[PDB]
Amino acid sequence: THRVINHPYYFPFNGRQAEDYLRSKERGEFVIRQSSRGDDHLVITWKLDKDLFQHIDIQELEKENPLALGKVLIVDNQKYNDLDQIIVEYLQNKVRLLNEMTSSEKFKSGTKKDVVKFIEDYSRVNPNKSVYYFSLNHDNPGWFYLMFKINANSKLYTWNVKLTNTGYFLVNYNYPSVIQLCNGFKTLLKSLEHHHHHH
């Protein structure tokens, strides 16, 4: 600490400029900035993919006096003792997970309009078979949405998924692996068709 202000990754720029600066750079780049309105809080900016940027507000605690540094930093609903661990434990997992998910064949970037036409078209080819897919949401960056259709005469169903630093969270269910998540749904779909719930 006591060096986060001049930290190597420290760069004074506006919110718009920060994204622009990272625009020419590659994915997985981050920066450290201080908010005048915060005074006791810091804001970090990072790039996800293409025209997509997100900001995270870092809150420090355990301050005994104005000259006392926050020995405890809260990030992602998690408590970290050292700043260095936060950067490494966040970028390493986020970079690998983001790259693994996007690099997944089960990843299509279709718009809301293209989603209906996509599911409807596919459903048309398979009216007697169910289908499920997921895509990136623009209204809520970082979160994933699951859409699926049982049949052409079936109503379109869409669910929401929460992204965490431990994997993927689906309606209060953590899936450490995307493969398990894919079946997880298939298993649920099978159970749903039988309306047997548990027994």
Query: In this structure, what token pair is assigned to residue 23?
Result: 């625009």
Q: How was this structure determined?
A: NMR
Distance CA 76, CA 151 (A): 39
3-state secondary structure of 53: strand
Domains, the chain, ordered by start: 1-99 (3.30.505.10), 100-199 (3.30.505.10)
What are the CB-based long-range contacts (under 8 Å, 24+) for 89-97? 89/165, 90/165, 91/28, 91/30, 93/165, 94/28, 94/165, 95/27, 95/28, 97/167
CA-based angle 190:170:115, to the nearest 5? 75
Contact (CB, 8 A) for 44 and 58: yes
CA 112 from centre of chain: 19
| Backbone break loci in the chain, preceding residues, C–N > 2.5 A | none
76: region left, alpha or beta (phi > 0 left; psi from -120 to 50 alpha): left
Contact (CB, 8 A) for 150 and 133: no
* Alpha helix (H) residue ranges in the chain: 15-24, 83-102, 112-125, 178-194
For the chain, give the number of residues.
199
